[PDB]
A paper describes a structure:
To gain insight into how evolution adapts functional dynamics to low temperature, we have collected a set of kinetic measurements and high‐resolution crystal structures of a psychrophilic GTP‐dependent phosphoenolpyruvate carboxykinase (Polaromonas naphthalenivorans; PnPEPCK—T growth ~ 4–20°C, T opt ~ 20°C) (Jeon et al., 2004). PEPCK is an important metabolic enzyme that catalyzes the bidirectional reaction between oxaloacetic acid (OAA) and phosphoenolpyruvate (PEP) using a phosphoryl donor (GTP, ATP, or PPi, depending on class) (McLeod & Holyoak, 2021). PEPCK has three active site loops: the R‐loop, which coordinates the substrate (OAA, enol‐pyruvate intermediate, or PEP); the P‐loop, which coordinates the nucleotide or PPi; and the Ω‐loop, a flexible lid that is disordered when “open” and orders/closes over the active site after the Michaelis complex is formed. Ω‐loops are non‐regular secondary structure elements that are characterized by a narrow beginning and ending (β‐sheet structure) with an extended medial region resembling the shape of the Greek letter omega. Structural comparisons revealed substitutions in the Ω‐loop that likely increase the entropic cost of loop ordering and reduce enthalpic stabilization, hindering efficient active site closure.
Author numbering: 6 to 460, 471 to 622
The structure:
């Protein structure tokens, strides 16, 4: 009778899973339970349900085929870090970068909120694989959600549906995820187009891998595979099992001889992982190609051959729309030509979408005369001047399948992963940090990643500040020990670089053109990996000289280059003071190796 009241499909053979779904249905009390099979027809039917509710508007089929626009409640527009918790058994295993609560107290807080939360709604059972299906390195999650928006976005972002239960079999384990918009409906009550609750919780219980999300229907709060599972829970699993879950793009780069390298790169917002992961080689780089394995999350495991192998556990892109155009990211623009869900962007008079930055592709770079903004209001360039209103919300999004990307790498879903030749850690700094620096050693590269900041300078170690599943200082130790254990196997460790696209010149403008021209920095990294690139040893590492880069096709002078690449001792003395402040905030439980690196920089500054 239980299984019959859950509408359990015949292909679900896993008794532990069914028992858990039954417990959550008993708690949440949905009116009906629907198991998502992941079919295209199911996706279309759910999209139609969203249209019928007013959550979606279907975009013009001649402008933007099979695409939809959703606009959210203005209270529910982004991840809410202050409402996100790591509820480890001990507070020290959440650490200073995480919000903590004793698990039993949090369970007592969440039980009355989830009791009956889905009254008047359908519970969607969303099975998904993070990583290629059936693979030895993939992990299965099940998200229960009362939002059809979550179901359709999860279809794009993960490997979702019936095929999961063949991999789960009768006894396979899974990450249990529960999500509610926190808006139960009474009989005859008219629903809103974007149900949500002012009260929000996004809770992780690491010891049981549970994720509970209440009150938001948006993005990283509600699509639980992306951040909650693939970074917060997965980082915990990696620490116990010897692998890494990182906030990194993964790209392949092939030179004209056909030699292929892979790079994993973490940016806090610098560049945009999305821009760099889909980089188009500029003039001077005929015969080179750049391909995308992923644009956001990397799972990385050492193999017996002494190499680090990365996979992208996601299946689509959930990208920030504003700023995207054919100059900053043509592969992304081409990706969103159709089959895309857009959230909180603007609506044009011909039933297409618009966002700030798209005018860069228009004749004269002219803004549109009129739009409907993401709040449903009339928008014009005059109105924008008078109210300051942006047409698209700054955190507005596109959701699109990886296979829409013309630069998708052939191995993007290869379960064996790709060997990482270099890590890159970015950051937006007007001063101090060179365009590119190679770390002299693994430990010094870890120091660079641990101390990376973005502009006042906010520190975001490894770009993981909002996403660490356990104590940040223990995570630094995990990186150091992984490198040590690999080097002890004889392995050659990946190079580590820091980049900075955002040094300002004496006129306050960015000197480095960026976007496709970042290929010229990537090509120096490749030369270094091959042992053919030259560089200047300085206080913090090795940086190219002007003559070490390929300038074919770009008018960029030696003085411009030295303006963004030279190091200054006064600036780095001030920078080390800021590192000291960060280390105090991390309560000095830091690995001794980070202290030794700081001391060695200080010695070079005083020599
Ligand atoms: Mn991200």
């Amino acid at each position: 009778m239980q299984g019959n009241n859950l509408n359990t499909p015949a292909y679900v053979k896993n008794a532990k899973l069914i028992a858990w779904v039954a417990d959550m249905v008993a708690l949440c009390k949905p009116d009906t339970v629907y198991w998502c099979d992941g079919s295209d027809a199911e996706y279309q039917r759910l999209c139609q349900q969203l249209v019928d509710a007013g959550t979606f508007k279907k975009l013009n089929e001649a402008k933007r085929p099979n695409s939809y626009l959703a606009c959210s409640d203005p209270s529910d527009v982004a991840r809410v870090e202050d409402r996100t918790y790591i509820c480890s058994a001990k507070e020290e295993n959440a650490g200073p970068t995480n919000n903590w609560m004793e698990p039993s107290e949090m369970r007592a807080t969440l039980q009355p909120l989830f009791d009956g939360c889905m009254r008047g709604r359908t519970m969607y059972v969303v099975p998904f694989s993070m990583g290629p299906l059936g693979s030895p390195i993939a992990h299965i999650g099940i998200e229960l959600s009362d939002s059809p928006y979550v179901a359709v976005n999860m279809k794009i972002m993960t490997r979702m549906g019936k095929a999961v239960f063949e991999v789960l079999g009768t006894e396979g384990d899974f990450v249990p995820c529960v999500h509610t918009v926190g808006a139960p409906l009474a009989e005859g009550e008219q629903d809103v187009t974007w149900p949500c609750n002012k009260t929000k919780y996004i809770v992780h219980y690491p010891e049981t891998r549970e994720i509970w999300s209440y009150g938001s229907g948006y993005g990283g709060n509600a699509l639980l595979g992306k951040k909650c599972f693939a970074l917060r829970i997965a980082s915990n699993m990696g620490r116990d099992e010897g692998w890494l879950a990182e906030h990194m793009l993964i790209l392949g780069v092939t030179n004209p001889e056909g030699k292929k390298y892979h790079v994993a790169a973490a940016f806090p917002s610098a560049c945009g992982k999305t821009n760099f992961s889909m980089l188009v080689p500029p003039a001077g780089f005929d015969g080179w190609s750049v391909t995308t394995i992923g644009d956001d999350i990397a799972w990385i495991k050492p193999a017996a051959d002494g190499k680090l192998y990365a996979i992208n556990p996601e299946a689509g892109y959930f990208g920030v729309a504003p700023g995207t155009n054919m100059l900053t990211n043509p592969n992304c623009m081409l990706s969103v030509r159709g089959n895309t869900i857009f959230t909180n962007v603007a609506l044009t008079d011909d039933g297409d979408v618009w966002w700030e930055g798209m005018e860069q592709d228009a004749p004269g770079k002219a803004l549109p005369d009129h739009l409907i903004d993401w709040q449903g209001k009339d928008w014009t360039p005059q109105i924008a001047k008078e109210t300051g209103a942006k047409a698209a919300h700054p955190n507005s999004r596109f959701t699109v399948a990886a296979t829409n990307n013309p630069a998708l790498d052939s191995a993007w879903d290869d379960p064996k992963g790709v060997a990482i030749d270099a890590f890159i850690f970015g950051g937006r700094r007007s001063t101090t940090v060179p365009l590119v620096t190679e770390a002299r050693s693994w430990v010094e590269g870890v120091y660079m990643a641990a101390t990376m900041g973005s502009e006042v300078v906010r520190r975001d170690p490894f770009a993981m500040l909002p996403f660490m599943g356990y104590n940040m200082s223990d995570y630094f130790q995990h990186w150091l020990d992984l490198g040590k254990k690999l080097a002890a196997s004889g392995a050659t460790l990946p190079k580590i670089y820091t980049t900075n696209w955002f040094r300002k010149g004496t006129d306050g403008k960015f000197v480095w053109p960026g976007y496709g021209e970042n290929m010229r920095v990537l090509a120096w990294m490749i030369d270094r990996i091959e042992g053919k690139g030259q560089g200047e040893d300085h206080v913090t590492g090795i940086s190219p000289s002007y003559e070490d880069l390929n300038w074919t096709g770009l008018d960029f002078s030696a003085d411009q280059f030295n303006t963004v690449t030279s190091i200054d001792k006064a600036a780095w003395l001030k920078e080390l003071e800021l590192h000291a402040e960060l280390f105090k905030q991390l309560e000095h439980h830091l690995p001794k190796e980070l202290g030794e690196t700081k001391a060695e920089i200080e010695r070079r500054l005083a020599a």
